[PDB]
Amino acid sequence: ETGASSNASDKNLIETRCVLNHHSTQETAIGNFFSRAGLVSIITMPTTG
Amino acid sequence: DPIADMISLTALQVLPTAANTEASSHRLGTGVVPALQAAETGASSNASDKNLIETRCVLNHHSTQETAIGNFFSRAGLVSIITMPTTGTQNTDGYVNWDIDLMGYAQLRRKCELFTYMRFDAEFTFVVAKPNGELVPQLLQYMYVPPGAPKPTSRDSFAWQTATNPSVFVKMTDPPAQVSVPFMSPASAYQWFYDGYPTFGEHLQANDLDYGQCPNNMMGTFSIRTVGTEKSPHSITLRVYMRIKHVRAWIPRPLRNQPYLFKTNPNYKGNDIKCTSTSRDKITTL
Amino acid sequence: DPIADMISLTALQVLPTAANTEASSHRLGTGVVPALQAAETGASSNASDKNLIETRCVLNHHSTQETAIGNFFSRAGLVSIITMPTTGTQNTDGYVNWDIDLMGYAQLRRKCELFTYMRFDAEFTFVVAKPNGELVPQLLQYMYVPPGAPKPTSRDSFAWQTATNPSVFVKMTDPPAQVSVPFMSPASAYQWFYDGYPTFGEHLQANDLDYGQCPNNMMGTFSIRTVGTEKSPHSITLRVYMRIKHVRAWIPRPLRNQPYLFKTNPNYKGNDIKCTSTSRDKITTL
Amino acid sequence: SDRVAQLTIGNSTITTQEAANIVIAYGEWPEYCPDTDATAVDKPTRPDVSVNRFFTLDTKSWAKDSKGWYWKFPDVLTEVGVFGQNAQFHYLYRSGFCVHVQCNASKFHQGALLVAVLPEYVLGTIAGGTGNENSHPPYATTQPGQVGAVLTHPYVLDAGIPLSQLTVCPHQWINLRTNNCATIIVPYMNTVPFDSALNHCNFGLLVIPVVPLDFNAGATSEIPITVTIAPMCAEFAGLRQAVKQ
Amino acid sequence: SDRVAQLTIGNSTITTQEAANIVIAYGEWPEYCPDTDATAVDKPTRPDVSVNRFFTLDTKSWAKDSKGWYWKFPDVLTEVGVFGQNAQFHYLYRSGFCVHVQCNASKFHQGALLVAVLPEYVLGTIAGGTGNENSHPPYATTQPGQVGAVLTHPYVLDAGIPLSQLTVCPHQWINLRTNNCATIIVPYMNTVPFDSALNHCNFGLLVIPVVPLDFNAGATSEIPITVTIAPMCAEFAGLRQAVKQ
Amino acid sequence: SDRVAQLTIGNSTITTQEAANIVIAYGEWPEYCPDTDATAVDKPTRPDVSVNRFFTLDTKSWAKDSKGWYWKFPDVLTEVGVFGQNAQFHYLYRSGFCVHVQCNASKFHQGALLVAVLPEYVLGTIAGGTGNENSHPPYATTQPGQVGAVLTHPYVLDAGIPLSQLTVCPHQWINLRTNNCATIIVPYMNTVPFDSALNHCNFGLLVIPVVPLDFNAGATSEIPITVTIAPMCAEFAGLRQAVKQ
Amino acid sequence: TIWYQTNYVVPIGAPTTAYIVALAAAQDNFTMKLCKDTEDIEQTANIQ
Amino acid sequence: ETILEVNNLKTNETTPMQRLCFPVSVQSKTGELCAAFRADPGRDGPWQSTILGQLCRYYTQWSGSLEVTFMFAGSFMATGKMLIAYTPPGGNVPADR
Ligand SMILES: CCO/N=C/c1ccc(OCC[C@@H](C)CCN2CCN(c3ccncc3)C2=O)cc1
Ligand SMILES: CCO/N=C/c1ccc(OCC[C@@H](C)CCN2CCN(c3ccncc3)C2=O)cc1
Ligand SMILES: [Cl-]
Ligand SMILES: [Cl-]
């Protein structure tokens, strides 16, 4: 109800081992999400019609 | 302390040249026998030229660089031929979806299967032309469709908007397109052999085609089309070449000695089992 | 370190006398409430006289020594009556074998069953006489036959040679024989209750008599006879008394409140379940 | 700060917002067997998280005329999860336990359950009623397994001993107006450092309604009682083939 | 001092008076998974002595015309002892292995067995003989279990690859005039730190008579080959209910 | 100490004995526009207490089948008190807001209201049902004024976007068994430092019953929802004659 | 899977049926990689 | 956190608001199953309604621990205990509690 998301983590609910996580967070930077060219318009110019 | 019970013989070396040969003389004695071995141990013989004969000194400067796995693999080779005919049986719709699988051609496949696991980046080159090798002013689009992304269903499918997937637009008259691809498996290395099943459950003969299939090797779809709302009057053949780079290989294995039959498995022609070596009449004559 | 994951709130006190009472006055306030408790926790009330009333000072010198388990148990009590008649149903052969079991008499049994486990040494006294209490010049032999040792089968059995077993020779006219016995269980303490079975296997109703029997409590046989090759003309009654000493007890339990029926189990008379306390007519009158 | 609580062990977590503290039987925490007390010489196996976790047994229904129930340890788990498997493959076993009995109602229901742990809980029979028959409890009664059994004479705990004195044993009360659970941590108790998980039950758990359940017609009538337990410091020795009994 | 040897692990001991050294596959000893390579977050269970001990599978009979046999790991043990149980109750598994193949004859018999370990041993079919049928090996052939399977075309290892090159893999020879056993210690090999013991066989063990058995009529003709294996550093994670496949 | 609260601003004070904390939208407090961001050169007027105080708008009735309601800021107050007057006399305006939605029931009622703030809440139409009609919302729907409007398709917030994702916006829940109000402090959000209080609504407030109201026949059925709001740091510039729209 | 550990108990006067809202999100050790187009949006017709 | 559509039935489609929450009620039998769903965040199903599910569909691969918070919206007078379980790959929907 407070409007906050849960602060519970794996170690709070179960017995955990140690994991040295080297997984990168760079590809989810808004910059890499948007900087990919995409179609925004198709302009046609016919000869007859 | 109340409870007491609760408390690699190989290193890399840089060998830029072949081993030299030291001069040796005659050895006449007992106790020592370099020529005798015991292959049962699983070890290869440690006997060297100087142990079995009198040798001179040879300062060997022969390089060992060309046999580095890197130079063995980093040579572009054919891995796929995608045709897009105008009239006939195949896609006359102006677009083709190809599931990425590099096991369709022998030369490159036999080289990779020398190892069990391989990790690497790759350079893909796209040589395109008409079936007879001629070239015409045709605009093409190559798109990489990762697993889970919508595959185009026509030449005008929305998927070609390619707002997130990577696409390459190039003319058939331009030089071959070329791009670098990273190591994309969810696992730490690709594996040419997976002795297991992809999922749990009973494995009845109806689903035996699952055996050996590892999703960690399934990189998705490669889609291609002619850029236009109208059909193109030109037949197109796309030859895809791959060049391995920044490679690492693990666990060598016996090299394929039977012709390949299928992409997804090691099946061989049972009635015609080729012998690894050619034959002769007697064992006492060349 | 490559793998990180691989790396009593009660003490004894000497209380020789009862707690004294400190003088207290009146307490008139909020927040603090010693009289209110929460029996659900499983704890007994911690409220004391001074918390509920105004008290004076009392220097209490009352000793707590007589309630030490040692003084409660170290009082000899009857644990067996062994008779040896001359004519009749029982052994008229001049010898008797008694399997040691102290659960045949209520007084001493109820005291022991107050605890689950008990470890102790014991002093056994043997009062012998004729059935009418008279005494005659008769020579007797008492022998302890540990589990596994041959039990005498007659008055002249070789076992009476007692070359290794401990024996006591005494006259009926001598004072009562008396000896000390150590803690002999293979386990660390005797247990008056064993919720289990002695052996593995299926436990069909045919062998349900095994339930509750623990070999760790079975100390063997006590054999007695009149010393002679000829039959004695005197009837004999042997009353055995045990006195616990150097005792330790663990895990108190509810005290027996139903008459005892059998030595080897807690069975009670189902049609006549006695109430722990006497009754009255109304709850509002004495 | 005494009514709210969390018990996390293994890959399981229990929560409660209406507790009444926790009881540590005889003031001692479970512990692996030290080298001074041990006698068996083989290195024990201590599975850790695969066996020291919470297991939830079948649920019972509290009725206005229920007599009470009892379970025996480690019998209740000899056939469940990896704990059961270790108990069957090994001759020797020892461990402690965290017992969590659950039961919630509403602020309009009433009743009190006495939850106690009685070590070496040997049962007796009614001796044929008259007392002349030396009958004995069937295997199904002495070791009822995971389902637990029902008491026929709660007043004497089916063993000739007064229920009124059961509080002399580690216990808690589940009084509906106060709390909705009971928690008792039990250490290993025996005359031997290790023992057969099959032939010997170290203690029994008793849940007895001393104050009958009651509520007005119209209020929920299905008031269940659930038992969740967790082995603690489970050790096993004397490995061999599996044996169920 | 190289022909005599003793392997003691768990409550089991193996002896041999005619060995030919021991092979440590790829020069690496088995080891638990370190925190840098691990990815799954739950604390693993490492049963130790109950699962890292020697297990003896069924014996095979070496005949003058035997083709050879193969077994797959950990398939062979997924249903044996406490190891099997942990493999069934957990999603994830990893371990190394000590393989000891036994075979003794007399100073008058002759023959040589090649004992090798081939990781990711994917089998193939004869494709209907002609090569036009894309058939696949049955579950009973890919994972033969504890009984092991027989090779139909040892020359190509039933997979289109030359047996003459199998020595490029960790291996030993059991040449009757020299030794009576082979021992290979295998470390965990995979593209992932842990994996399903049910859906994936990390490697296969091959015992193939490259030099046929032979002896004069009158000499013992029953020459058995026994396989004894021991998991090493067995770890398990992702606990849940038991699953056989 | 987290359930009880007092909000005093201007000559008004709000109290609550069953709150669930307070939310500061995007972690920022309202503030007057600094000289680096400002662009208009005239000295602003900052009325202070006459406009930064609590205003209570009309009350809505929560029924078992209510769809939900929404209001737009600063539209709701453009015609109330001295705030409205300043909004009408000035071209430019900016401010933050303290939103306090109230709703109390009894310990026997149940239901959950999601109270959220969605900036730039642009509404859409059903496009004539078929989707071939490019219709647009009437002025009365885009700027419903103080009375607020009703949602016709709460599931898509009348704008083709999932209500299930609205929690990605500053929000609180009013779950009857837990709290009786929601409080959200909202800072000024726009692509310009000041803007017209008449032509542009910076954000909309949505009160949607995700869990329907429910209670037994006999319990009070009139369960109202009241909205009280307070401008914060209200600034005005570009003075001239009054303009209502 | 969600199971009844005991039971949903209620006194006289309160609904015998209530609801539960489920909210989900990722924890701090969560990441994604290999950007691709989604399946959850298509352009069946033209957008005028 | 965003709302998960656990109650994504075919008979809900015409009244979508009902998919945003699932029911619990007085049972007469013990150990009953209240609901079940896959944990797969990028798979078609309940997760599709979450911002996490939608966003992770813009990526081919994912890694990490997930978290599901359940909020009880019954009356203050109602009580009860639920067993929420997560079964790792291998076993179908557990037959019983
Ligand atoms: C803008 C479009 O350009 N993109 C070109 C492109 C080319 C290749 C792409 O992925 C290539 C994946 C290969 C480097 C590895 C494929 N693998 C990994 C192992 N494997 C395989 C096949 C059969 N059995 C076992 C393993 C494979 O076929 C993706 C995009
Ligand atoms: C030279 C002859 O003198 N020896 C006398 C003697 C007396 C007693 C002897 O052993 C007495 C053993 C008792 C101290 C304990 C017997 N116990 C141990 C627990 N136990 C029992 C009985 C029934 N159910 C459970 C336990 C027993 O009956 C041995 C020799
Ligand atoms: Cl296009
Ligand atoms: Cl004599």
List the bound ligands.
the ligand CCO/N=C/c1ccc(OCC[C@@H](C)CCN2CCN(c3ccncc3)C2=O)cc1, chloride ion
CATH topology of chain D: Jelly Rolls
Helix content of chain D: under 10%
- Largest sheet entry of chain A: none
Q: β content of chain A, as a range?
A: under 5%
Count of DSSP-assigned helices of chain D: 2
State the CATH architecture of chain D.
Answer: Sandwich
- Please state the structural category of chain A: mainly alpha
Give the CATH level 1 class of chain D.
Mainly Beta
How many DSSP-defined strands of chain A? 0
Order of helices and strands of chain D: EEEEEEHEEHEEEEE
**Class by helix and strand content of chain D?**
mainly beta
Distance between the termini of chain A: 61 Å
Instruction: Give the strand content of chain D.
Output: 35-45%
For the terminal residues of chain D, how far apart are their CA atoms? 45 Å
Rg of chain A is 24 Å
Helix count of chain A equals 2
Family (chain G): Belongs to the picornaviruses polyprotein family.
Protein name (chain G): Genome polyprotein
Subunit structure (chain G): Interacts with protein 3CD. Interacts with capsid protein VP1 and capsid protein VP3 to form heterotrimeric protomers.
Function (chain G): Protease 3C: Major viral protease that mediates proteolytic processing of the polyprotein. Cleaves host EIF5B, contributing to host translation shutoff. Cleaves also host PABPC1, contributing to host translation shutoff.
Question: How does this model look, in words?
Answer:
The structure is cut from a larger assembly and holds 3 copies of chain A, 3 copies of chain D (245 residues) and 2 copies of chain G. Helix content of chain A is 18%, strand content 0%. Chain A contains 2 helices and no strands. Chain D has 2 helices and 13 strands, in the order ββββββαββαβββββ. In chain D, the strands form 3 sheets. In chain D, strands 3, 4, 5, 7, 11 and 13 form a 6-stranded mixed beta sheet that branches. With 48 residues, chain G is mainly β. Chain G is built from no helices and 3 strands. At the D-G interface, strand 13 of D face loops of G. The complex binds ligand YM2 (2 copies) and chloride ion (CL) (2 copies). One copy of the ligand CCO/N=C/c1ccc(OCC[C@@H](C)CCN2CCN(c3ccncc3)C2=O)cc1 binds at residues 100-103, 122, 124, 142-144, 166-168, 179, 181, 190, 192, 217, 219, 222 of chain B. Chains B, C: It is found in: Host cytoplasmic vesicle membrane; Host nucleus; Virion. Chains B, C: This is Genome polyprotein. Chains B, C: Interacts with protein 3CD.
